[PDB]
A paper describes a structure:
The chloroplast envelope Quinone Oxidoreductase Homolog (ceQORH; At4g13010; molecular weight 34,034 Da) from Arabidopsis thaliana is associated to the inner membrane of the chloroplast envelope where it represents 1–2% of the crude envelope proteins. Despite its original annotation as a “QOR,” ceQORH is inactive on quinones but preferentially reduces γ-ketols in the presence of NADPH. γ-ketols are long-chain reactive electrophile oxylipins and are potentially toxic. The ceQORH monomer is formed of two domains with (i) the catalytic domain including residues from Gly3 to Pro132 and from Leu277 to Pro329 and (ii) the cofactor binding domain (Val133 to Leu276) showing the classical motif of Rossmann fold. In the ceQORH structure, the internal chloroplast targeting sequence is folded as a two anti-parallel β-strands (Thr71 to Gly81 and Asp91 to Leu97) connected by a long loop (Ser82 to Gly90).
In crystals of apo-ceQORH, the asymmetric unit contains two monomers related by a non-crystallographic two-fold axis that form a dimer. The monomers are very similar with a value of root mean square deviation (rmsd) of 0.25 Å between monomers. The buried area in the dimer interface is 2,410 Å2. In the apo-ceQORH dimer, interactions between monomers mainly involve residues in the α-helix Pro254-Met267 belonging to the cofactor binding domain. Each α-helix in the dimer contributes for 723 Å2 to the buried area, being 60% of the overall buried area at the dimer interface. In ceQORH, the residues (Thr251-Lys269) are folded in a loop-α-helix(Pro254-Met267)-loop. This α-helix interacts with the non-crystallographic symmetry related α-helix in the apo-ceQORH dimer. The orientation of the α-helix (Pro254-Met267) prevents the monomer of ceQORH to interact with another monomer to form a dimer similar to that observed in dimeric QORs. NADPH is always present in vivo and the dimeric apo-ceQORH probably never forms in cell.
Residue numbers in the entry:
A (entry chain A): 4 to 329
B (entry chain B): 3 to 329
Write the structure that this text describes.
Amino acid sequence: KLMHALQYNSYGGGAAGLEHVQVPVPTPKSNEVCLKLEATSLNPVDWKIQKGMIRPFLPRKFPCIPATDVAGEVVEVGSGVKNFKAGDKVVAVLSHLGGGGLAEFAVATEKLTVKRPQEVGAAEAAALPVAGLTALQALTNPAGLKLDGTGKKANILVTAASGGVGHYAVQLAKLANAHVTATCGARNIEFVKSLGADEVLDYKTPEGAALKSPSGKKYDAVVHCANGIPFSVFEPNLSENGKVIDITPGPNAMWTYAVKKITMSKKQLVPLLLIPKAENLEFMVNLVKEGKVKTVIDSKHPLSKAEDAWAKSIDGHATGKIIVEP
Amino acid sequence: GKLMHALQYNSYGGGAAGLEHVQVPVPTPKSNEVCLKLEATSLNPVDWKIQKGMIRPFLPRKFPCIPATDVAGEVVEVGSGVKNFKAGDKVVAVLSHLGGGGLAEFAVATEKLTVKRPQEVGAAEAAALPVAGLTALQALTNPAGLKLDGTGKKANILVTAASGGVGHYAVQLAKLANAHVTATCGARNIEFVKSLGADEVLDYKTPEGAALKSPSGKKYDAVVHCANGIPFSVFEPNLSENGKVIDITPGPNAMWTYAVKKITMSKKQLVPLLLIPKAENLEFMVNLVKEGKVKTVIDSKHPLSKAEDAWAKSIDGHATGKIIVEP
């Protein structure tokens, strides 16, 4: 049997290089489940890979069916799978950031598959893994926040807060009882405010460009989802041992990190390298089930027009998360 | 103001020839600092790499630059906030932020990175310790996860370029943790590395050595990788299921290769070692040396008046153990 999918065949083609195809339905390996997809979300790293940001390592092969964040129903399980059976609703992270999400079916490893409770729809779940776990990891590891009421107090800054990672980060930080400052564009100020941010800066204004807290807060940590801001801009806004947590770091961020750690600066730049874990996804899924975290969907698009979604992703102005269905 | 002898370089890329003898003011310690009359200074590869430009434009912070960070000496003046040290104390220290300072008669160290030198540990053997020894110590106790009481279950450890500064401490530290140790070096240094306690020694000029192939067919749980020019592909089939390559003195490429491997979730991992020097760890090392459980091997000693010789020896890469300038 064949399935619809989208793929690209080389670097740099953008949405135009995204091509509709029919490929074999995958067979799960022994530790895998095969999913009939119900929803897939896009992440910026998906088109960055296409652009060549992580060449030659990714993709492993052309052509590449992109996207990793999915939700669907199990239809076949590998010979070593115990926790899942045909008919289970799940959310998963597709493996090794090697795509498979823009298709009708995908295989996920059992380790990166988590049950989807009835109360959580497919789109709102598929939106979670990369963006949500990234936010979750930024705030609980380098920012060191606790999500109950244990937890040290903190001043947190979220740049590009209306985007995928940013909109989860703002919500997560308020659960950790942090004071939250956010930057975004004029159009999204009310929306970010509604996510619970205490202060919202328009990054087009001198104050916003300066990342200057209106109440004069210094930030203990920054969830930095935006681009093009030198450390020098952050530095005077940081507390004594403040950290800039760089989301989706490139080669330059990784080296700047090395030398700063080397030279022992008190104010630190921390790249966030996501390690997705089932427990954390479960945790996030449950927050969404309890309504403690809200998944905001920017737009939905059918697989037959997924190039539209891709283009929306590349253009960078999504509010929340972009969804392709399946 | 009194002057002191020092060596400095004024731009990138000059090598030993660009090293110049000068007289500069003796430093005044800030409130959290001690001023040391130096008795010894050791060189580290990162010292000439910085001069070469490996970390431009971040280092050095200014030209000219008096290089080297690993020192031992006697306190002669303390800043107004210093309590744990007084004039006359013998100490070993790491000079700050890799802004050098060590090829001089006096230097200032922060109290946080200054540790007492016990009588039984000479100045040269202590000055050799900080960067090379703490690097080794951090590689084995954090990503390798070994315990230095030896009761831990037994790892297979590989040390590449084991006759060098970091390598020679790593081999000794790994034997304290009761690991099985495989080491690579040149033909000339095989007996020396064996004497450090390595269980297996490979000549890296032989096909087996180039392949990093354990003679007894061990897979390595961790590699303290002090050598250069070895792709991950060479390590990979010698690694255990979740083995790690701990890259000593990583560059831009290592840091990015690390990111993407972690990102793609490979079970065999490349770990860059970014040294975080701490007083408690230096104390610990100094005490090991005092107890004779770790030996400092000194490659050669040179007077400050001829420190360009030491620098050249460092750049050339064939030191056995640690190179020392006095002061």
